[PDB]
Motif scaffolding. Structure first.
Motif, mmCIF file in Angstrom:
data_model
loop_
_atom_site.group_PDB
_atom_site.id
_atom_site.type_symbol
_atom_site.label_atom_id
_atom_site.label_comp_id
_atom_site.label_asym_id
_atom_site.label_seq_id
_atom_site.Cartn_x
_atom_site.Cartn_y
_atom_site.Cartn_z
ATOM 1 N N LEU A 157 24.294 -40.208 -48.629
ATOM 2 C CA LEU A 157 24.641 -41.469 -48.455
ATOM 3 C C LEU A 157 26.107 -41.624 -47.664
ATOM 4 O O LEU A 157 26.191 -42.074 -46.587
ATOM 5 N N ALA A 158 26.951 -40.862 -48.138
ATOM 6 C CA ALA A 158 28.149 -40.553 -47.369
ATOM 7 C C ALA A 158 28.099 -39.895 -45.956
ATOM 8 O O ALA A 158 28.817 -40.353 -45.015
ATOM 9 N N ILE A 159 27.363 -38.822 -46.178
ATOM 10 C CA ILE A 159 27.001 -38.113 -44.748
ATOM 11 C C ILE A 159 26.340 -38.903 -43.651
ATOM 12 O O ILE A 159 26.644 -39.263 -42.596
ATOM 13 N N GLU A 160 25.458 -39.841 -44.378
ATOM 14 C CA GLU A 160 24.516 -40.609 -43.171
ATOM 15 C C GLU A 160 25.245 -41.812 -42.741
ATOM 16 O O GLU A 160 25.112 -42.198 -41.722
ATOM 17 N N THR A 161 26.180 -42.443 -43.444
ATOM 18 C CA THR A 161 26.945 -43.857 -43.514
ATOM 19 C C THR A 161 28.199 -43.894 -42.849
ATOM 20 O O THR A 161 28.751 -44.483 -42.205
ATOM 21 N N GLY A 162 28.731 -42.294 -43.283
ATOM 22 C CA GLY A 162 30.309 -42.497 -43.272
ATOM 23 C C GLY A 162 31.208 -42.980 -44.152
ATOM 24 O O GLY A 162 32.339 -43.085 -43.985
ATOM 25 N N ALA A 163 30.355 -43.709 -44.928
ATOM 26 C CA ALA A 163 31.002 -44.339 -46.353
ATOM 27 C C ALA A 163 32.225 -43.233 -46.967
ATOM 28 O O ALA A 163 31.678 -42.151 -47.098
ATOM 29 N N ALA A 164 33.103 -43.846 -47.580
ATOM 30 C CA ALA A 164 34.187 -43.005 -48.147
ATOM 31 C C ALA A 164 33.426 -42.679 -49.812
ATOM 32 O O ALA A 164 32.806 -43.499 -50.523
ATOM 33 N N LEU A 165 33.519 -41.604 -50.122
ATOM 34 C CA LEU A 165 33.017 -40.992 -51.232
ATOM 35 C C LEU A 165 33.955 -40.878 -52.288
ATOM 36 O O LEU A 165 34.649 -39.825 -52.285
ATOM 37 N N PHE A 166 34.096 -41.602 -53.202
ATOM 38 C CA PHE A 166 35.381 -41.684 -54.244
ATOM 39 C C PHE A 166 34.796 -41.158 -55.402
ATOM 40 O O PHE A 166 33.812 -41.971 -56.118
ATOM 41 N N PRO A 167 35.318 -40.215 -56.042
ATOM 42 C CA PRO A 167 34.876 -39.822 -57.417
ATOM 43 C C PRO A 167 35.415 -40.783 -58.375
ATOM 44 O O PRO A 167 36.410 -41.399 -58.086
ATOM 45 N N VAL A 168 34.934 -41.244 -59.395
ATOM 46 C CA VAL A 168 35.421 -42.115 -60.220
ATOM 47 C C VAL A 168 35.073 -41.510 -61.848
ATOM 48 O O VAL A 168 34.346 -40.758 -62.144
ATOM 49 N N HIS A 169 36.182 -42.033 -62.903
ATOM 50 C CA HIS A 169 35.822 -41.681 -64.170
ATOM 51 C C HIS A 169 36.299 -43.059 -64.900
ATOM 52 O O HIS A 169 37.087 -43.588 -64.817
ATOM 53 N N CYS A 170 35.434 -43.047 -66.059
ATOM 54 C CA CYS A 170 35.621 -43.893 -67.124
ATOM 55 C C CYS A 170 35.714 -43.408 -68.401
ATOM 56 O O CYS A 170 34.950 -42.215 -68.682
ATOM 57 N N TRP A 171 36.600 -43.658 -69.030
ATOM 58 C CA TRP A 171 36.886 -43.267 -70.473
ATOM 59 C C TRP A 171 37.205 -44.369 -71.448
ATOM 60 O O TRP A 171 37.487 -45.498 -70.982
ATOM 61 N N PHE A 172 37.242 -43.929 -72.748
ATOM 62 C CA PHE A 172 37.571 -44.812 -73.771
ATOM 63 C C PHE A 172 39.019 -44.686 -74.009
ATOM 64 O O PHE A 172 39.758 -43.676 -74.543
ATOM 65 N N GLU A 173 39.791 -45.845 -73.822
ATOM 66 C CA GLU A 173 41.495 -45.650 -73.904
ATOM 67 C C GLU A 173 41.809 -46.457 -75.252
ATOM 68 O O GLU A 173 42.029 -47.777 -74.973
ATOM 69 N N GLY A 174 41.795 -46.167 -76.395
ATOM 70 C CA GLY A 174 42.062 -46.747 -77.463
ATOM 71 C C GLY A 174 41.150 -47.952 -77.727
ATOM 72 O O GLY A 174 39.820 -47.472 -77.628
ATOM 73 N N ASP A 175 41.545 -48.941 -78.248
ATOM 74 C CA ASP A 175 40.375 -50.040 -78.420
ATOM 75 C C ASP A 175 40.039 -50.846 -76.911
ATOM 76 O O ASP A 175 39.268 -51.614 -76.829
ATOM 77 N N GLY A 176 40.649 -50.230 -75.744
ATOM 78 C CA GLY A 176 40.406 -50.628 -74.468
ATOM 79 C C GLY A 176 39.575 -49.542 -73.695
ATOM 80 O O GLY A 176 39.050 -48.719 -74.193
ATOM 81 N N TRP A 177 39.626 -49.763 -72.395
ATOM 82 C CA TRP A 177 38.990 -49.076 -71.531
ATOM 83 C C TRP A 177 39.654 -48.435 -70.406
ATOM 84 O O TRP A 177 40.548 -49.152 -69.670
ATOM 85 N N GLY A 178 39.790 -47.019 -70.335
ATOM 86 C CA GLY A 178 40.357 -46.357 -69.013
ATOM 87 C C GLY A 178 39.278 -46.259 -67.803
ATOM 88 O O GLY A 178 38.317 -45.690 -67.995
ATOM 89 N N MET A 179 40.095 -46.436 -66.611
ATOM 90 C CA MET A 179 39.121 -46.223 -65.510
ATOM 91 C C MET A 179 39.945 -45.753 -64.447
ATOM 92 O O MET A 179 41.178 -46.093 -64.430
#
Ligand SMILES: CCCCCCCCCCCCCCCCSCCNC(=O)CCNC(=O)[C@@H](O)C(C)(C)COP(=O)(O)OP(=O)(O)OC[C@H]1O[C@@H](n2cnc3c(N)ncnc32)[C@H](O)[C@@H]1OP(=O)(O)O
Length: 253
Positions: free
Chosen positions: A177-199
């Motif tokens: 998709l990134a090659i075909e469209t030129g769209a930026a390819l961002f890696p992402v991570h989500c994790w659990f940060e205490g009782d909250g959420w880390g992203m």
């Protein structure tokens, strides 16, 4: 759970038998947390969640949307990605993703209804009116973000990559998709940060090579580093690496 232990074994670089029990426990607790939150997430106050949770280096993504390029967010099954989806729905707007057509179909309908109730547009990977990577490519060419779960795809069309030092297969979609469209390819991570959420959003991957395998390898490397950072939050309870497949499953791919 045993496959999870064996996978964390890949993650921490120890034989499966020696993986600390507490890590396996914490990973199971995070997994349970994922499902407990997934159950109730649609009924929570999404505005509040959108207002009160933060994403590290989100400006990476925003500048991509300001430049009119669209964006591909590729992430592993860590933390609560549905929560990230809610954050994005609230902070940007609806986005498009894809889902495996589970069995039975009624359950598939349940899941579609679930994510649609979070505000996502969900495409069937198979059996939809049109092919998914056309709608997705069209979403990207309209300067919109899409999100893809991107560290697992053990089918013939999956890309062979090294992941924690052993061969696995990952979906080609983010790179294609990134090659075909030129769209930026961002890696992402989500994790659990205490009782909250880390992203967090990571710097976009270079797509200048136009080569799906190298790019998917860089993506994989980042996934490996991020999972290495929060091993308990990566709930991969299914087989991941090629070597753990039976000869019959190794054949189908
Ligand atoms: C903080 C940030 C916020 C983050 C928020 C995160 C929220 C995330 C929540 C999401 C929750 C998700 C739940 C988990 C779901 C995970 S499923 C993972 C999906 N992974 C993917 O990669 C999806 C993309 N899928 C595909 O790309 C497949 O459909 C492909 C295209 C790879 C299938 O390939 P294939 O079966 O090998 O197809 P072939 O190339 O062998 O040939 C068949 C098709 O090729 C297609 N094809 C060939 N070239 C071409 C060509 N250049 N571009 C197009 N498609 C062509 C062609 O369309 C043709 O079909 P036809 O045209 O209808 O005959």
């Amino acid at each position: 759970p045993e496959q999870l232990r064996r996978n964390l074994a890949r993650v921490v670089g120890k034989p499966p038998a020696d993986v600390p029990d507490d890590l396996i426990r914490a990973s199971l607790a995070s997994y349970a947390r994922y499902w407990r939150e997934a159950f109730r997430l649609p009924a929570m106050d999404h505005g509040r969640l959108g207002e009160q949770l933060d994403v590290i280096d989100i400006d990476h993504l925003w500048s991509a949307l300001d430049a009119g390029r669209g964006a591909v967010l590729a992430l592993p099954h860590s933390g609560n990605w549905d929560m990230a989806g809610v954050w994005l729905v609230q902070n940007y707007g609806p986005f498009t993703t894809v889902a495996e057509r589970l069995k039975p179909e009624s359950l598939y309908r349940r899941f579609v209804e679930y994510r649609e109730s979070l505000g996502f547009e969900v495409l069937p990977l198979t059996g939809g009116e049109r092919p998914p990577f056309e709608v997705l490519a069209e979403r990207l060419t309209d300067n919109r973000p899409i999100c893809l779960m991107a560290e697992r795809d053990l089918t013939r069309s999956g890309v062979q990559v090294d992941f924690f030092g052993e061969a696995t297969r990952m979906p080609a979609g983010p790179a294609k998709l990134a090659i075909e469209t030129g769209a930026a390819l961002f890696p992402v991570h989500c994790w659990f940060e205490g009782d909250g959420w880390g992203m967090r959003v990571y710097p976009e991957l270079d797509t200048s090579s136009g080569d799906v395998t190298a790019i998917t390898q860089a993506l994989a490397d980042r996934f490996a580093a991020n999972i290495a950072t929060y091993p308990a939050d990566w709930h991969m309870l299914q087989p991941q690496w090629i070597a753990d497949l039976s000869d019959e499953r190794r054949a189908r791919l």
